[PDB]
């Protein structure tokens, strides 16, 4: 039924940017050469790997994430709407505990959203 909406939710986020981006400079690569096409295929692949139970999201987010998400293993912690990236926000709050969205085209690139809570 209608469960009370949680004030704070948490999402594990992986970011795969593209060469043509607002900032193609990350903690791993100072310059990103992969094009948008690559970014998309990478995301699509990682999603399928998470679905098949190949590798842990934490491991993936600590490796193949251009964003400094590796510091928290990809975890964003308990956050609320209004303080999150808009395309990411409406995506996270559109999921549930143990749910994962698809390629979320956000500001700097595509994010994978896996909610543990």
DSSP string, 53-77: T-S-HHHHHHHS-SSGGGGGTTEEE
- Look up residue 85 and give its two tokens: 């990236």
- Is-contact 32 20, C-beta < 8 A? no
Structural domains counted in the chain: 1
Technique behind this structure?
NMR
- Is-contact 99 117, C-beta < 8 A? no
Strands 75-79 vs 104-105: parallel, antiparallel or unpaired: unpaired
63 is catalytic: no
Q: Among the options 12, 13, 26, 92, which is catalytic?
A: 13
11 is catalytic: no
What sign has the CA pseudo-torsion 35, 37, 38, 43?
A: positive
Which of 56, 9, 1, 66 is closest to 33 using CA atoms?
66
83 is catalytic: no
Task: Give residue 40's domain range.
Answer: 1-117
Which of 34, 111, 38, 24 is closest to 76 using CA atoms?
111
The CA distance from 9 to 2, in Å, is 17
Q: What is the CATH number of the domain that holds 23?
A: 3.10.50.40
Q: Among the options 11, 18, 69, 111, which is catalytic?
A: 111
Q: Among the options 12, 18, 65, 67, which is catalytic?
A: 67
The CA distance from 66 to 63, in Å, is 8
């Amino acid at each position: 039924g209608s469960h009370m909406e949680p004030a704070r939710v948490r999402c594990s986020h992986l970011l795969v940017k593209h060469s043509q981006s607002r900032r193609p400079s990350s903690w791993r690569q100072e310059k990103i050469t992969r094009t948008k096409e690559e970014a998309l295929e990478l995301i699509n692949g990682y999603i399928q790997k998470i679905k098949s139970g190949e590798e842990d999201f934490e491991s993936l987010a600590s490796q193949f994430s251009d964003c400094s998400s590796a510091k928290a293993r990809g975890d964003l912690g308990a956050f609320s709407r209004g303080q999150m990236q808009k395309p990411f926000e409406d995506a996270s709050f559109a999921l549930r505990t143990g749910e994962m969205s698809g390629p979320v085209f956000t500001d700097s690139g595509i994010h994978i959203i896996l909610r543990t809570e």
